[PDB]
């Protein structure tokens, strides 16, 4: 029993973190096989960031302008190239700790673990979601640039996020591991702001199912709703529309608990319309949207507390 915001064990990623330095700028990189991946902003002074032309800035650099430190060992850079907003530094040594891995670009609403790192040294691990507005609500300080987000499935690390910057509202923006930003953001010092965000409806429904599996039913009701009528209410409360695909994805949780998806939707509609009136769900006084249906299945028992 119990339900916690749970990250994946971070050891497979810890063994990949290194420090990259170019000139006076230092940040983290990810060392897989004989390549180190890091934000291309490592080549910029803070003055370069106002209107960088990265192709122009990088042609001015040579391999020896890049210092890569892995623990107590300097790795010699023997090639470099830029892919979107990431730099790829070929080094003379393959990381003996390279896990089985993939790079994946995730959809909004998916969750992942972040290994926050400073100067190549992992600091902490936490779980977060890609928001609908393509920011993450992370926890990052100066020096965190280059930290990665990931999911793990049967000892294969799927990397999905590399950290680049913090927006004025304190939320975070970054790229996939091929250097493509999530959202409209760019690696330039210019006005950029997070768009209005929305709540991830299918994840709130999954978490209501987690609450039932763990033995709680107080918020349920005898009603149902049509998908169309639910979405009319969702739109009013700044929730994303629920699609039939989301309904299908919630099938396994629905089957485990005996609560039809549209019936859980009627429960959520009532919660949005009336509030919680002093009650909590899974220890929270707000509706939580950072657990996917897969997260719930992975963490909860396969036997419901009836």
């Amino acid at each position: 029993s119990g339900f916690r915001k749970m990250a994946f064990p971070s050891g497979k990623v810890e063994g990949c973190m290194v420090q990259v330095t170019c000139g006076t700028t230092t940040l983290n990189g990810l060392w897989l096989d004989d390549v180190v991946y890091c934000p291309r902003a490592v080549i910029c002074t803070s003055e370069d960031m106002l209107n960088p032309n990265y192709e122009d800035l990088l042609i001015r650099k040579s391999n020896h302008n890049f210092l890569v430190q892995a623990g107590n060992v300097q790795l010699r850079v023997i090639g470099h190239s830029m892919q979107n907003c990431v730099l790829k530094l070929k080094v003379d040594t393959a990381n003996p700790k390279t896990p089985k891995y993939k790079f994946v670009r995730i959809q909004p609403g998916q969750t992942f673990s972040v290994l926050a790192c400073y100067n190549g040294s992992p600091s902490g691990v936490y779980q977060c979601a890609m928001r609908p507005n393509f920011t993450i609500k992370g926890s990052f300080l100066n020096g965190s640039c280059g930290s990665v987000g990931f999911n793990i499935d049967y000892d294969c690390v799927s990397f999905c996020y590399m950290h680049h910057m913090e927006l004025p509202t304190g939320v975070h923006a970054g790229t996939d591991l091929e250097g493509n930003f999530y959202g409209p953001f760019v690696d330039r010092q210019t006005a950029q702001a997070a768009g209005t965000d929305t709540t991830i409806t299918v994840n709130v429904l999954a978490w209501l199912y987690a609450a039932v599996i763990n033995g709680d039913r107080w918020f349920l009701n005898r009603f149902t709703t049509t998908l169309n009528d639910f979405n009319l209410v969702a739109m009013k409360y700044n929730y994303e529309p629920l699609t039939q695909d989301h309904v299908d994805i919630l099938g396994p949780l629905s089957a485990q608990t005996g609560i039809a998806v549209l019936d859980m939707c009627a429960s959520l509609k009532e919660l949005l319309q009336n509030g919680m009136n002093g009650r909590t769900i899974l220890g929270s006084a707000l509706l939580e949207d950072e657990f996917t249906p897969f997260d719930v299945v992975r963490q909860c028992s396969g036997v419901t507390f009836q």
């Binding site: 100066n142 640039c145 280059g146 680049h164 910057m165 913090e166 004025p168 210019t190 950029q192």
Partner: peptide, 9 residues
């Protein structure tokens, strides 16, 4: 504001 790149010095 602008944005904050989070490298280190």
């Amino acid at each position: 504001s602008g944005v904050t790149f989070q490298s280190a010095v």
